[PDB]
């Protein structure tokens, strides 16, 4: 609706909020960011575990946790190639959502972006929604 407002006002010059909607959009976004972060965390250790795989045939020692990654290493690695674009797109969408939902009330919060970037580097979803509602 923010984009629609801006573009329709532009066309004109040429020629309400549900206080829970932000919560719904953030709950929609959360699985995607969780999946991207888990992608990164697993592909960080894929190659280190592969160095251990080549010895002693993996009969008794590897933890089951990383054993779940030793099989799907290929799919993890081929999705990590596309991950950064999705992560950047998600960060941009979140910052636009934040800026616009503060813009409707009549404010200009183009300055609090770096704190939001740091929060997303941390990504405490509850701290994220707290930063959304508070400032």
């Amino acid at each position: 609706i923010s984009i629609l407002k801006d573009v329709l006002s532009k066309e004109a010059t040429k020629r309400e909020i549900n206080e829970v909607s932000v919560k719904h959009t953030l709950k929609l976004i959360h699985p995607k960011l969780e999946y991207q972060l888990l992608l990164a965390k697993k592909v960080q250790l894929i190659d280190a575990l592969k160095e251990l795989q080549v010895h002693e045939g993996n009969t008794n020692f590897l933890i089951p946790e990383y054993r779940c990654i030793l099989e799907e290493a290929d799919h993890l690695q081929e999705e990590y190639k596309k991950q950064p674009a999705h992560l950047e797109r998600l960060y941009g969408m979140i910052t636009d959502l934040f800026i616009d939902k503060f813009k409707f009330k009549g404010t200009n919060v183009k300055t609090k972006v770096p704190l939001l970037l740091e929060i997303l580097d941390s990504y405490d979803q509850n701290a994220l929604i707290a930063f959304f509602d508070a400032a």
Binding site: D47, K50, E51, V54, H55
Partner: protein, 101 residues
């Protein structure tokens, strides 16, 4: 054409590090680098050689024409090793300090 033979080797081969050499003198085999700095040898079973160091070159040829065996060479960014796989014995293990690219 049609592939006259096929096989699947469970080890990731480093791209530019592959050689074919008759390491038994008359029995050609495949030498190829792998992850963790190990060089594998396919005889026609796979046999590992612990270079224990990130390989950067690999070839195989006749280094002393007095005998009819291929010598497996293995280069590393600080070392160079000739290897008689048949009678496992270093032909020469030189330290370059300039690298093996």
């Amino acid at each position: 054409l049609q592939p006259v033979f096929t096989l699947k080797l469970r080890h990731k081969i480093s791209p530019r590090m592959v050689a074919v050499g008759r390491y038994d003198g008359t029995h050609p085999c495949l030498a190829a680098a792998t992850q963790a700095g190990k060089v594998f040898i396919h005889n026609p079973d796979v046999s590992l050689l612990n270079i224990n160091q990130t390989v950067s070159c690999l070839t195989a040829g006749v280094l002393n024409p007095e005998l009819g065996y291929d010598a497996l060479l293995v280069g590393t960014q600080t070392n160079l090793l000739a290897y008689d796989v048949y009678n496992n014995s270093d032909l020469f293990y030189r330290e370059v300090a300039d690298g093996a690219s």
